Ligand binder design. Sequence first.
Ligand code: RU
Ligand code: RU
Ligand code: RU
Ligand code: RU
Ligand code: RU
Ligand code: RU
Ligand code: RU
Ligand code: RU
Lengths: 173, 173, 173, 173
Amino acid sequence: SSQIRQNYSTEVEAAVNRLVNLYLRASYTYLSLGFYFDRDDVALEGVCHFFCELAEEKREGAERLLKMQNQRGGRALFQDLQKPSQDEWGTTLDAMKAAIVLEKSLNQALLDLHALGSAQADPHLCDFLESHFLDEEVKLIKKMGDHLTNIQRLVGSQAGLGEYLFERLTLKH
Amino acid sequence: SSQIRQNYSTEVEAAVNRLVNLYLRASYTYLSLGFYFDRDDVALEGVCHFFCELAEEKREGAERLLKMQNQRGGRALFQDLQKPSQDEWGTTLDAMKAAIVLEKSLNQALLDLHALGSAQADPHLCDFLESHFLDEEVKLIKKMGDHLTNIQRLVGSQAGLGEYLFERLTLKH
Amino acid sequence: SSQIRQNYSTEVEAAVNRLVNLYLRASYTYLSLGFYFDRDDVALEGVCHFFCELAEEKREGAERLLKMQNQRGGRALFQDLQKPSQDEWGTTLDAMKAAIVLEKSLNQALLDLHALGSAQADPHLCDFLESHFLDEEVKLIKKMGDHLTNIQRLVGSQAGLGEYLFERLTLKH
Amino acid sequence: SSQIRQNYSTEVEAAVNRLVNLYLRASYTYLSLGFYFDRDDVALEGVCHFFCELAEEKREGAERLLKMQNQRGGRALFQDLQKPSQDEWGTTLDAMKAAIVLEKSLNQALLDLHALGSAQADPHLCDFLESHFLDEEVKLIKKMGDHLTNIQRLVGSQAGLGEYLFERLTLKH
Ligand SMILES: [Ru+3]
Ligand SMILES: [Ru+3]
Ligand SMILES: [Ru+3]
Ligand SMILES: [Ru+3]
Ligand SMILES: [Ru+3]
Ligand SMILES: [Ru+3]
Ligand SMILES: [Ru+3]
Ligand SMILES: [Ru+3]
């Protein structure tokens, strides 16, 4: 049993474990997106790299949450990771829309956990989120939004040409 | 239209645009102070540098607010910048008092925006202010207060001599 | 009161103060252009950089004018900076046309001030403009004209694709 | 006889020779000022350095005028250099006032020669002055004005103390 736990509610402990599951689930989704874009019949290497990097970032997010859970004297509890929502992710546009949907859901979970910690007078939890997660997520969402706009600009008339150019000229490869 | 905006009230968006205007206005005030101290009949180069550096800091403050406004999916709206309150700024003492008055007003605007964001459950906004503005302003005000005290100590009997020495021995030039 | 002023008419002094206001106003316009292009639903980073750099150049222009005003024994007088003419700037093409319109107006103001200084037999003023402003403005206008031509070439049939390519392949990002 | 002279009036040639004499005369004045401040009963080394450096600058000015006179095919003609106006230069304040009087007279001579060259359609002469003399003189006069203001600020009550501090804290030594 913990000899350190202090000001760390059971409600926050449980919500941290759920947020871990949401981050790991997001990582898994991004692994599936990344490998889809590496298929021989899709073959958009910059898209593949973008999602593979997100998979790693989301995993790191989960690991930071787990580290904090132990630092506070909470107990990590793991659940199943549900498989991603799709087996094939459509076009780069479809994929980036799906990514923004996912990130908005993670952001709302962060916000919901921050509200819980504020209500429970848990300022360490609030600070931990503010310092490692909230701004990182806002910056990520802004980048995805920027990408989506450029993707959309490029569909117009000649969607294949637009998809190739976005991958070649915007995404790292 | 934004595809990213999330938990970002119209009230905060508008108050961020007003704070931008307040920061730019402060920058403009400091440009006028700086150039006043560069006049041939004033000629206090360290005072000139101190205000010119503040002009740049306030501009940077505004640009960081604008960047954040876009990161959140808000829309920057610019108003007129009102000319500074004075055309001539008196002595170094008068000027540093005017500077502290200005900074207190900016600080109160920061505090008012932080209170708004807390009431709207906007922790990213609160964190953004805490991390980039609130402490920076407290440190600045403390430095201006320190300066004012040393300026005041030096008036006593021989105000011209005191004004020269402060500029030469405290301010960078 | 100045002990240095020599061959520096009240007419030139006033026109220098107006040119300062025109340069600051141009800087402000360029700040608004820059931030428009950073919006999530516009997202043209090279365009954003181009205008942000112009904002800084115009500010520097104003500061050089103010420095000269003091060097000559004139007195800087600041007015309101009027907000930019538009809140949203349309396409890259619309924006670069607006930029060239702005620059032509600044150029005409430079030319008008040079004519004034020639009529007043103020060769230092004339030289100051020739050496720091007139050629810089001609080079800038030529660059904007070059850009506009390439933008225009690229609209043809597929305006979104053209806008993306210009930003990616011409503008620094 | 010159085989090169072109667009170089006898009037400009003569006025260039007079300006040489005015610059050398200014150099001589500054030599006398410099050595006055090196006297054992004056002993203000930073003041001595400031004037000794001006002596050298004025000499260099004359040499540049003479070089140009030959470049244009004119003939240098030298007159007597009149001794400086005073044998003893009073206080630093008296000296800096005398310096500004001298520089204003040189500036007016530059301006008068520029007006002559403009009337004679001698753009090389005009450019030569604009590029090597007019701005250099404006910057110098502004520096002397700045100094005079700081000197004046420091007299107030305790003129000896003010004179020492100016020399120690403003002037290079
Ligand atoms: Ru790959
Ligand atoms: Ru991959
Ligand atoms: Ru200065
Ligand atoms: Ru300054
Ligand atoms: Ru940008
Ligand atoms: Ru920008
Ligand atoms: Ru010496
Ligand atoms: Ru000397």
